[PDB]
Symmetry: none
Subunit: 147 residues, 4 copies
C-alpha cells in the first residue's frame, strides 16, 4: 500500500490487530515481523491498511487520531460500541469511545453523519444538539430530533 | 467509507486537506461540512469537518479546537519509489512550517507525523537475510530524510 | 483504490464474491450496486486485492490469459484451496492451475515451488521445474525431493 | 504477495512490465526470473516470469507463448482525479500499439484491457440519486475516452 496507517503499541500490536480482525468486517492480520519478539504487525481494519509497532510506552494515543466507523443501524452501532468498550475500553461523548490500547474510535451511524451535513440547517442543528447529549448514539433519538 | 481516518485540527482542517491534496499523489479534498450550530470551538457556519482522501485512505479533518495534540502514536507511512519522490514529499512537509525527525519521520505544520519511507528501506528491513536487515536498520538510524543509495550499500 | 481488478460475470458476481470471501484470507464482500435504472456490480476483496465484479451477461469468457496466483505455505493449505475451487463446480488443470465455476483461472502455488524454480542453483531449479510439469495439484514433498 | 495477478504474454512480459512501470504512477519492475530449462514457449535462460507492481497491485507477467489470448473478461480499472491524468493514461495505452474502446475502456499492445475511469464517473453511476446516475450512465455511453465535464453536466 502506498499509504499505511501506523499505530504505536506497548507490547500488544498483535493482540490488538487480532481483536480488530475478529470484531470488524473486512479486517485481518496480514503479516507478523520480528526485529532484524514481534516488532511489527501488518493488518487491515475495514479496508484500511495498517502497521502496528511494538515500541514500548514512549508514545500515548489521544483523540487527535480516531477511526470513525459508519454504522447502518442500531444493532450494528450497539455491537461495535459494546465490543470496544467492554473489552477493557471506555465510553466517551458523541459516539466516541476508546479501546484497551488507548486508541479512539467513533461508532457513528450513517443517519447521524447525513443529518449533521444536511442542507436543511434547522434539522441539522436539531440533530447536532441531540448528539451533544449522548455517549453511545441512539439513532431513533437522532431521527426524531432531525424530523 | 466504512472506516475513515479522523484527524483533529484547531480551525485548520480545510487548510491541511488542501495542502495534502497539492502535495501527495492521488489525493483530493472531497467535501466541506459547515457547523449547523455553535459549539465549543466554532460558530455556526464555520468549517466543522472536511472529507479528503490521501493515497487510497479516506480521511476526515475535524475542527475541534486546541483540546488535543498529535504525537507519534499515530503516523501515515508513505511508500516512495525513488529518491526524487522521497525528497519531494519530505521537503514539502518540512518546508511548509513543518519539522524534520528521524529515520524518515517528519511532522507537518499541524503536528501530524508522516513517514516518507522508500520501499527499498522497508524491503531491506523485513528481509529474510536477517543480518543484512539489521545492517539496513542500523544505517537508517543515522538519517533524517532517507538516502536510498546509502541504505542499499549497508544492505549489501 | 487507484487500481481495481475488474472481472466479468454472467449473473453471478455476488455468488462468486461471496465464495471467494469464505474461501480465502483477507477477503470480503464490500458493496453491492444495482443498475442506475438486479445486482449490476459487486465490490470485493480477494487476499488484499480490490476487485469489481460486473454482471454483464455471457458476452465475454474467461481464459488462462488472466489468473490469480495464490502463494501457499504447506500441503494442508494447498489442498484446502485447490479442493475449494475444483470441488465447487470447477476443474483441475496442470502445474497448480485450476478453474472456478465462473471460469476464472487460479494457480495454487506453494511458496517452496516458486522459490525452487527461481533458485540460483540451476540444476536444482530445473529438477523442480521438470517435476512440476508432471503434476496437476502441486505435491510439495515431491517438489522438495526433486529439488534436493 | 499472497495473491498475485498473473498475466499471459507471448515472449513480451519484460517489455510490458517495463512499459507499465514508466507509464503509470507508483509502478515498478521488481524481479526477472529466467527459465531453468527448455519449455513449450522458451529456451533455458529466456525470461519466464517478471514480477511487477502497478498502482498497489502485485503482478506477474508470464511468457507462455501464443496459447491463450486476453479479453474484456479481465480488466484493470484505474481511477483518475482529473482530465489531465485521464488523457495521459488513455493516450499512453492506446498510442503504444493499443486500441481505443468504449466508456473508458481501451486495450494495450499485448491485448490487455484497461479502463481509465474518472472517480467522478464511478461516483455518479453508483449514486442513490438514481435518475442522475442514469443520466451519467447514458452520457458515458456516448464516449470512448471519458470527458469529465460532460459527465458532470449530465449528472446535474
Amino acid at each position: 500500500s502506498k499509504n499505511t496507517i501506523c499505530l504505536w503499541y506497548d507490547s500488544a500490536a498483535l493482540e490488538a490487530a487480532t481483536f480488530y480482525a475478529e470484531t470488524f468486517p473486512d479486517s485481518a492480520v496480514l503479516a507478523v515481523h520480528r526485529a532484524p519478539d514481534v516488532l511489527t504487525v501488518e493488518f487491515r481494519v475495514m479496508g484500511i491498511p495498517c502497521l502496528g509497532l511494538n515500541g514500548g510506552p514512549a508514545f500515548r494515543h489521544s483523540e487527535a487520531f480516531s477511526f470513525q466507523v459508519a454504522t447502518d443501524d442500531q444493532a450494528e452501532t450497539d455491537r461495535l460500541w459494546n465490543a470496544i468498550v467492554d473489552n477493557g475500553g471506555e465510553e466517551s461523548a458523541c459516539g466516541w469511545c476508546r479501546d484497551k490500547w488507548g486508541i479512539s474510535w467513533q461508532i457513528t451511524p450513517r443517519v447521524l453523519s447525513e443529518a449533521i451535513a444536511s442542507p436543511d440547517r434547522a434539522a441539522a442543528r436539531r440533530a447536532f444538539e441531540a448528539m451533544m447529549t449522548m455517549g453511545r448514539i441512539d439513532i431513533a433519538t437522532i431521527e426524531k430530533a432531525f424530523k
